[PDB]
Coordinates of C-alpha atoms and ligand atoms in Angstrom, one line a residue:
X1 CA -19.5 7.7 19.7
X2 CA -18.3 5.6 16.6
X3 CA -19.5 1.8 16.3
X4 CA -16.2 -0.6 16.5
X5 CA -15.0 -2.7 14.0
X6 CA -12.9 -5.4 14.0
X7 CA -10.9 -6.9 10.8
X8 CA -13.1 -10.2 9.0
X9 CA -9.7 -11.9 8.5
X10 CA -6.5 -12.4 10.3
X11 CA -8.2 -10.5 13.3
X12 CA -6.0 -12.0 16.0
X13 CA -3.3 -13.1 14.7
X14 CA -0.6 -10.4 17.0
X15 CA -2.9 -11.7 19.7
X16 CA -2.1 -15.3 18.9
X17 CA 1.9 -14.3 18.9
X18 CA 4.5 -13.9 21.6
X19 CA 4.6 -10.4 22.3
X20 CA 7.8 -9.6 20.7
X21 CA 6.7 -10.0 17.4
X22 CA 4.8 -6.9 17.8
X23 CA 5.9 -5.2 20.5
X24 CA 8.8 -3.2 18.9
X25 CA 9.3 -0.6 21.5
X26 CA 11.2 -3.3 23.2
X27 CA 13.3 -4.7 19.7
X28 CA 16.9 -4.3 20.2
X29 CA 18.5 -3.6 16.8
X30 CA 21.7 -5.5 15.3
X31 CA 24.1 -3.1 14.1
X32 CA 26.2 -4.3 11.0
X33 CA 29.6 -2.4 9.9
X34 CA 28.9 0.8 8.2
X35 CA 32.3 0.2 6.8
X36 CA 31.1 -2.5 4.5
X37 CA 29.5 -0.2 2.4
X38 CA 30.5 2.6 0.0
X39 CA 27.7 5.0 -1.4
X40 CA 27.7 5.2 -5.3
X41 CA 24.7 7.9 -5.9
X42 CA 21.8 9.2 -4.9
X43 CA 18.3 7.8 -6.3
X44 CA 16.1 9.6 -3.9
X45 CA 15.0 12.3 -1.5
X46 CA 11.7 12.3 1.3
X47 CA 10.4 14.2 4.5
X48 CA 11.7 10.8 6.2
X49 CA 14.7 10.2 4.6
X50 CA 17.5 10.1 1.2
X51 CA 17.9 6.9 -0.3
X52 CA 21.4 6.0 -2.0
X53 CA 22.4 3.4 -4.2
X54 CA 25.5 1.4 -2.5
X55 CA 28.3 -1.0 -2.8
X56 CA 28.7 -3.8 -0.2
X57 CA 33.0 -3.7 -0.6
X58 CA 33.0 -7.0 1.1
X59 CA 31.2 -9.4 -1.5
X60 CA 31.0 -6.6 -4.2
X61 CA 27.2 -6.5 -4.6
X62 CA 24.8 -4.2 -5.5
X63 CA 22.3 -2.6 -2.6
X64 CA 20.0 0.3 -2.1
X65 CA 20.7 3.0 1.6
X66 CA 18.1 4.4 3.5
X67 CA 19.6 6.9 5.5
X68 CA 16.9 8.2 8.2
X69 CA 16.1 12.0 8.9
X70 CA 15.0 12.5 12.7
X71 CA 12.5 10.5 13.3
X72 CA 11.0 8.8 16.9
X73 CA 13.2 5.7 18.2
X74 CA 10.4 3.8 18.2
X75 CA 9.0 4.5 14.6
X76 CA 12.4 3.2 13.5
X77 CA 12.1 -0.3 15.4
X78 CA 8.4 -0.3 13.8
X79 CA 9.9 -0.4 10.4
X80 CA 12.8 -2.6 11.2
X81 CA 10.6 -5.2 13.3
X82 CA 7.8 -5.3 11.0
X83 CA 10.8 -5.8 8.0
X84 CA 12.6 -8.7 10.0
X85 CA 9.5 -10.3 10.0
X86 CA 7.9 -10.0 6.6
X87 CA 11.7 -11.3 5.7
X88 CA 11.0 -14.2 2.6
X89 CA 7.9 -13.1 2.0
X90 CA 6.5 -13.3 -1.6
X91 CA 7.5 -10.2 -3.0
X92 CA 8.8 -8.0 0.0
X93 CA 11.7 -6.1 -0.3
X94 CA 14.6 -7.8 1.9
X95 CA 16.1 -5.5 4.7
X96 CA 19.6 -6.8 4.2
X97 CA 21.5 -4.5 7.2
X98 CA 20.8 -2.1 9.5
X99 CA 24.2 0.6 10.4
X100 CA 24.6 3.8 12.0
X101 CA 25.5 6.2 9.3
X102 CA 28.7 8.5 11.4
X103 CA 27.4 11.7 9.1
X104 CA 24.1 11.9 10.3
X105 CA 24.5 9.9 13.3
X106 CA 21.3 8.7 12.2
X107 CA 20.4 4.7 11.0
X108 CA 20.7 3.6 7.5
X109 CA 18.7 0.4 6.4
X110 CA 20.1 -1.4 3.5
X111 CA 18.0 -3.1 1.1
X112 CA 18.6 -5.4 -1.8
X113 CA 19.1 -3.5 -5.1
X114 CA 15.9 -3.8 -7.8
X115 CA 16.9 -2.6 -10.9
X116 CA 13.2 -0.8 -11.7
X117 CA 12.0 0.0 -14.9
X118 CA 11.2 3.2 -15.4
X119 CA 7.7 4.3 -14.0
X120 CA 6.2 6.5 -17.1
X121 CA 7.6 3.8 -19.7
X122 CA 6.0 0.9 -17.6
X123 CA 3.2 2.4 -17.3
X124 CA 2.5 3.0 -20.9
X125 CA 3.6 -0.4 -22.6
X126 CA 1.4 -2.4 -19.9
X127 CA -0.7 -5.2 -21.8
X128 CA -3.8 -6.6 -20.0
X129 CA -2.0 -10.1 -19.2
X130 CA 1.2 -8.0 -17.2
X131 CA -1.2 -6.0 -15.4
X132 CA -3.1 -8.9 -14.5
X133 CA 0.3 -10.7 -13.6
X134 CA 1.9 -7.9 -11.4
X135 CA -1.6 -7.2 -9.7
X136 CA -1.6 -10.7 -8.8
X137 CA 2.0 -10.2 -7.8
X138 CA 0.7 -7.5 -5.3
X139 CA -1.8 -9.6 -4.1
X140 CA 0.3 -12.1 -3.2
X141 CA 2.4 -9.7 -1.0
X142 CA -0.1 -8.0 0.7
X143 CA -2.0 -11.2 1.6
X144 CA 1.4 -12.6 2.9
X145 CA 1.6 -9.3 5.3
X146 CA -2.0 -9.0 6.7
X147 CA -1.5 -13.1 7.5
X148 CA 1.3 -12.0 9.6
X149 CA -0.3 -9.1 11.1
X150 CA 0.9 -6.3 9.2
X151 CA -0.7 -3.1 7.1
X152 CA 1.5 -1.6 4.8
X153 CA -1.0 1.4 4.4
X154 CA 0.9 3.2 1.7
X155 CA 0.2 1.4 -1.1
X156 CA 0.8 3.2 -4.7
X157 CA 2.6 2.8 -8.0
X158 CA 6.2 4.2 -6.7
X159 CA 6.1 1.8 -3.4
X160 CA 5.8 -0.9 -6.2
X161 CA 9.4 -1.7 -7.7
X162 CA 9.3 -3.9 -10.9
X163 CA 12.3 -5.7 -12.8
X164 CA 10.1 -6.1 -16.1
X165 CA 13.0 -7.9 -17.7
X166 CA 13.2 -10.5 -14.7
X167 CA 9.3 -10.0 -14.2
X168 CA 10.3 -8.8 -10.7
X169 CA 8.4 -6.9 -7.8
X170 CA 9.0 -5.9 -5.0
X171 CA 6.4 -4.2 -2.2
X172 CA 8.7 -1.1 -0.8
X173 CA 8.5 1.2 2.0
X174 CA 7.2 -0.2 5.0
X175 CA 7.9 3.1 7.0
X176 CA 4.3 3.8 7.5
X177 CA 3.1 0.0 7.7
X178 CA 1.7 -0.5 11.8
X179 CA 0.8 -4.2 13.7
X180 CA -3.3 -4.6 13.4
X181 CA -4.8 -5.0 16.5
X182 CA -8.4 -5.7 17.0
X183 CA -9.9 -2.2 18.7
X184 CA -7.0 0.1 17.9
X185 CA -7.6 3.4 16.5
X186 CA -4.8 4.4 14.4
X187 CA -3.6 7.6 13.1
X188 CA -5.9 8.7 9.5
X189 CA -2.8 10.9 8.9
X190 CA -1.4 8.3 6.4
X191 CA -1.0 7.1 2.8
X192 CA -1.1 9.6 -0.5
X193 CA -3.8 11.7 -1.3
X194 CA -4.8 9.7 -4.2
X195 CA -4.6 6.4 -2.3
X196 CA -6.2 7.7 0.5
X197 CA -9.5 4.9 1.6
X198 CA -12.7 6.8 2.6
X199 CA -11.8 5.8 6.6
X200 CA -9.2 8.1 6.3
X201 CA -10.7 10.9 4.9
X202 CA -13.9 10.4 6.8
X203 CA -11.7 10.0 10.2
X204 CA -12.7 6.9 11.5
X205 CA -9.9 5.3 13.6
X206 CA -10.9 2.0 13.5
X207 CA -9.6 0.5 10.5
X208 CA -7.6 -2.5 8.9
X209 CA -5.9 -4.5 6.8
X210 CA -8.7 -3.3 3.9
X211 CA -7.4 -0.1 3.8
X212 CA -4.9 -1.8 1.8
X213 CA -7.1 -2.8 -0.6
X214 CA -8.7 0.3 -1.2
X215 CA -5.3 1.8 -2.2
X216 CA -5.2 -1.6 -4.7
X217 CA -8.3 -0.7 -6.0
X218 CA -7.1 2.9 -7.0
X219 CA -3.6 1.6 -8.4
X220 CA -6.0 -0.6 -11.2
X221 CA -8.3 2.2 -11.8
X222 CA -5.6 3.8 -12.9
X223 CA -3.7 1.0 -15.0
X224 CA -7.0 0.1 -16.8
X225 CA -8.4 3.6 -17.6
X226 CA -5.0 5.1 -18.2
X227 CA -6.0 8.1 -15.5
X228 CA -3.1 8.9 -13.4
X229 CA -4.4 9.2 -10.6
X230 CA -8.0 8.5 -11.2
X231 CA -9.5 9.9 -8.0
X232 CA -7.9 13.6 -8.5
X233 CA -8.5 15.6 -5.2
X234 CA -7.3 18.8 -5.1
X235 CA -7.3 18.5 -1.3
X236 CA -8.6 16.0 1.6
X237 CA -11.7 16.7 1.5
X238 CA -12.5 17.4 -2.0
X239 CA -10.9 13.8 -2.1
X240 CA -14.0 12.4 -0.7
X241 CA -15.9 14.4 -2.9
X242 CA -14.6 13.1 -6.2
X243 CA -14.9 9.6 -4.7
X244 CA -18.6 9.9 -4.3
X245 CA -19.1 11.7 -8.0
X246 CA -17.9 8.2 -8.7
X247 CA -19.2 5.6 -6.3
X248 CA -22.5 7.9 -5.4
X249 CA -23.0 9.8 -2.3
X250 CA -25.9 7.1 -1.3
X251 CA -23.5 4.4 0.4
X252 CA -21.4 7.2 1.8
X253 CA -24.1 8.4 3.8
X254 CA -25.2 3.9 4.7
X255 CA -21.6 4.5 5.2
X256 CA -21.5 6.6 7.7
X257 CA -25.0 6.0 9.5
X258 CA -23.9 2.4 10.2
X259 CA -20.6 3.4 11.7
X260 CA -22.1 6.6 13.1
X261 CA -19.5 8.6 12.0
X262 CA -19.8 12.2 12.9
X263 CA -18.8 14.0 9.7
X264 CA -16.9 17.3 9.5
X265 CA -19.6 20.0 8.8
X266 CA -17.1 21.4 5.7
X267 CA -18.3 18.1 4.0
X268 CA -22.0 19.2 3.8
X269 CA -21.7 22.1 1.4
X270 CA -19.2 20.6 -0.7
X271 CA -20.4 16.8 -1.1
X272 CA -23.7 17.8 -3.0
X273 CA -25.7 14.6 -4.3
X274 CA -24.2 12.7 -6.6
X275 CA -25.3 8.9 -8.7
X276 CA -23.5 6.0 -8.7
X277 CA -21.7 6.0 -11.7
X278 CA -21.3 2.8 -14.4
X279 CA -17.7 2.3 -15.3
X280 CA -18.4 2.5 -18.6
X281 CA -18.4 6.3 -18.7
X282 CA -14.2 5.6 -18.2
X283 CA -13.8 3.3 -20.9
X284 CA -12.5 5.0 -24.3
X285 CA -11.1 3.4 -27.4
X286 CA -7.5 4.3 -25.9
X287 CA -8.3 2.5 -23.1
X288 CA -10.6 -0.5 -24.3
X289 CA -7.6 -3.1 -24.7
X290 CA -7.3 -3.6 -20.9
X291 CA -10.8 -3.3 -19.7
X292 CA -12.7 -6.5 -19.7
X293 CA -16.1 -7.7 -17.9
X294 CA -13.6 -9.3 -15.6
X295 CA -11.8 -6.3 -14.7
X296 CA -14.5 -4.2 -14.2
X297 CA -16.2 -6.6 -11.4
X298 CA -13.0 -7.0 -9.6
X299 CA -12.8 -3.4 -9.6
X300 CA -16.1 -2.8 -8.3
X301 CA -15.7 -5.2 -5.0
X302 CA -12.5 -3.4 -4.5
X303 CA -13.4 0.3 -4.2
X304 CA -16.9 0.0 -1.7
X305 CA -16.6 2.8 1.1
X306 CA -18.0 -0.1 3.7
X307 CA -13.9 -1.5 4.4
X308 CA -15.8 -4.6 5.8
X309 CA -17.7 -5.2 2.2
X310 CA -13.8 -5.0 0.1
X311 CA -12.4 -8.1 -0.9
X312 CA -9.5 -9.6 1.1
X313 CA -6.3 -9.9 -0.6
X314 CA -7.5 -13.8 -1.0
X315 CA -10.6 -13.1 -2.3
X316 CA -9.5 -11.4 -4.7
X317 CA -6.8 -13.5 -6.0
X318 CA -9.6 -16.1 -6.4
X319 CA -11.2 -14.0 -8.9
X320 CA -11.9 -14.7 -12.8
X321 CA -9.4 -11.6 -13.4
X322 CA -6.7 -13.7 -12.6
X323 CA -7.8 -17.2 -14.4
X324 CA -5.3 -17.1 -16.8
X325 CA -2.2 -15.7 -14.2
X326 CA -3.1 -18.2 -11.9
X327 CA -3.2 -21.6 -14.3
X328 CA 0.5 -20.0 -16.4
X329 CA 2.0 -19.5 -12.9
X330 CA 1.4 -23.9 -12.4
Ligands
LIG401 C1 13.6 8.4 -0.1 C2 12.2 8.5 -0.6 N1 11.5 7.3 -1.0 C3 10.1 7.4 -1.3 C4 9.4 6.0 -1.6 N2 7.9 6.2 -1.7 C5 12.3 6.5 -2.0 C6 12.8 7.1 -3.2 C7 13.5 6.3 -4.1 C8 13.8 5.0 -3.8 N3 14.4 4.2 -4.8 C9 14.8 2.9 -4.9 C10 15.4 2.5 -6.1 C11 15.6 1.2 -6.3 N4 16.1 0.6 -7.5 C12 16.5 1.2 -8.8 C13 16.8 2.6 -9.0 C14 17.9 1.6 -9.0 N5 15.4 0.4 -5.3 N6 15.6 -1.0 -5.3 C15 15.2 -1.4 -4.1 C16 14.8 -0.3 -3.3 C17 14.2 -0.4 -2.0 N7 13.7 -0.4 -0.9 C18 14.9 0.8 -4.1 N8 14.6 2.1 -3.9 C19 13.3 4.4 -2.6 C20 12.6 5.1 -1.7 N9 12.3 4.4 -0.5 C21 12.4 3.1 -0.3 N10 12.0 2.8 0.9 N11 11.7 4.0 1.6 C22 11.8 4.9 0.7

């Protein structure tokens, strides 16, 4: 069998709390008035649901309608509970109401409005400082939901909503974000491709709030290199593989001997042998402006296969990267 693992931070904190703050199979939902709100236009369309842009008619502002396809009772009191409790939390998107749409006869969350700069223009007139500042913006949310239990575990660019005018962000989409508990083996079937940590794609169960991190690490490869996405699988496996054509296939394999991970026999043929590679090789004069020394060995303690050996969302915003973020921000 596998060897167990247990988070190095914030391990029992559910424990530590009345059940109902975790237990939300049992979480009755408040309904608000579905008349309060008129929908203006669509913004969006997913396997889970279509996401409008509304009008609240009764105070005239501005909100954003998640209107649910099918999906398990209990799926939908997981986002809602773990949304009701993140509530104030630096940089979490507000859940404002909850109503039952009569159309779909299906539940519609409504969220504060963001007004988000557009993704492709963002992402090319980033300087060093604003990717330092809205990586430590991150931080600050994800650190604020593993305290209180919680792993979003779909981290990426387009769950990250930022008002660049207002220098605004916002963590969305906690629809596939679960309670951590210490020996619970959770479903590997989540997160994008491209975000996807090595636990995932190696199917071991046992994971945690680092998972998070990993996904982190693969958002500021991305920012700093300019390489969208920068670990490029054409598939899950091959995912791995380009992983470890980076990062080396030698601590894959420490990887999975000290977990004793019983590896898929495709992986054999396909994983090959393959260095550990210096980030240098990414760096280009494009590029050069927002790679530092710094960067680079935050980077590094981000994207380790062992999830125990990441940095926590604290540990990392203790790092040099974030210096000059941290002494503005005071
Ligand atoms: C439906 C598919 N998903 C997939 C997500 N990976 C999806 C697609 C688009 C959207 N768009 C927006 C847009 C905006 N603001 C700007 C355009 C005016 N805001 N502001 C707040 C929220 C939220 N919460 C939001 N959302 C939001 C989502 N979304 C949000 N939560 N779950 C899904």
């Amino acid at each position: 069998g596998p060897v167990p693992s247990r988070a190095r931070v914030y391990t029992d904190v559910n424990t530590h709390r009345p059940r109902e703050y975790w237990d939300y199979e049992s979480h009755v939902v408040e309904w608000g008035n579905q008349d309060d709100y008129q929908l203006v236009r669509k913004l969006g369309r997913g396997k889970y649901s279509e996401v409008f842009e509304a009008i609240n008619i009764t105070n005239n502002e501005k909100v954003v309608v998640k209107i649910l396809k099918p999906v398990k009772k209990k799926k939908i009191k997981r986002e809602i509970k773990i949304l009701e409790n993140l509530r104030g939390g630096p940089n979490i998107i507000t859940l404002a109401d909850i109503v039952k749409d009569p159309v779909s006869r299906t539940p519609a969350l409504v969220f504060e409005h963001v007004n988000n700069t557009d993704f492709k223009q963002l992402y090319q007139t980033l300087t060093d400082y604003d990717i330092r500042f809205y990586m430590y913006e991150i931080l600050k949310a994800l650190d604020y939901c593993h305290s209180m239990g919680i792993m979003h575990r779909d981290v990426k660019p387009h769950n990250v909503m930022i008002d660049h005018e207002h220098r605004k962000l916002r963590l969305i989409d906690w629809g596939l974000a679960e309670f951590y508990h210490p020996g619970q083996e959770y479903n590997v079937r989540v997160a994008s491709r491209y975000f996807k940590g090595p636990e995932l794609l190696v199917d071991y169960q046992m994971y945690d709030y680092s998972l998070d991190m990993w996904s982190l690490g693969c958002m500021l490869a991305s920012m700093i290199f300019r390489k969208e996405p920068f670990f490029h699988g054409h598939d899950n496996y091959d995912q791995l593989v380009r992983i470890a054509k980076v990062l080396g296939t030698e601590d894959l394999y420490d990887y999975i001997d000290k977990y004793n991970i019983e590896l898929d026999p495709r992986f054999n043929d396909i994983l090959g042998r393959h260095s550990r590679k210096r980030w240098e090789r990414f760096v280009h004069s494009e590029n050069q402006h927002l790679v530092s020394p710094e960067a680079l060995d935050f980077l590094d303690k981000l994207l380790r296969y062992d999830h125990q050996s990441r940095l926590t969302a604290r540990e990392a915003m203790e790092h040099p990267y974030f210096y000059t973020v941290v002494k503005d921000q005071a």
